[model samples]
Target: MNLRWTSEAKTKLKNIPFFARSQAKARIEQLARQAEQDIVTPELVEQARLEFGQLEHHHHHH
Candidate 1:
């Protein structure tokens, strides 16, 4: 089966550091596979963030 990343997942994943994109993508997909999900979702992306030290920052406005 072909696995795909949902828009929600993609959008969420975009927030991850560029240098870590590859690893993050791989980890997210692995998680999806473990859950037997054909489509990756935002939930998976959120879970993957924990592996990267759990970062969540605010956008700069100043």
Candidate 2:
């Protein structure tokens, strides 16, 4: 199945750290696949956040 991200979902993804953004995107896509969804919605983003923890505005002071 081809996966796509909604505008709002993409916007949310932008808030994630650059280093982790790709992983977060992949995780979301995986969730979408599990849920049999073709598009990633804002709600789906939130579900991913809950399932995989926060992916937005996270300050990784390492």
Candidate 3:
């Protein structure tokens, strides 16, 4: 079983909100486990990307 993680997926998993990361990671892993099943919508992923950017901003400044 080749379970290689793409850089994009790895990065998103690493940066998901702390409170939500476990569940999010689990859902992501479920998608992976299903053999390339895609569960996340592009717009939702884009929103998550933006939210992560804001978290990074806070992390850097405070």
RMSD of 3: 7.6
TM-score of 2: 0.68
Per-residue lDDT of candidate 3, residues 1-62 (tens digit): 32455666666666677787765655555555555544443333345556556666655853
What's the TM-score of each model vs. the native? Answer: 0.77, 0.68, 0.43
The local lDDT score (0 to 100) that residue 30 gets in candidate 3 is 55
lDDT of 3: 0.55
Against the unseen true structure, what C-alpha lDDT does each candidate score?
Answer: 0.83, 0.74, 0.55
Candidate 3: segments with Cα more than 4 A from true spot: 1-3, 36-62
Q: Say what the RMSD of model 1 is.
A: 6.4
> After aligning candidate 2 to the native by TM-score, how far in Å is the CA of 23 from where it should be?
0.5
Clashing pairs in 3: none
Which one wins on lDDT?
A: 1
Which 10 consecutive positions of candidate 3 have the poorest summed lDDT? 37-46
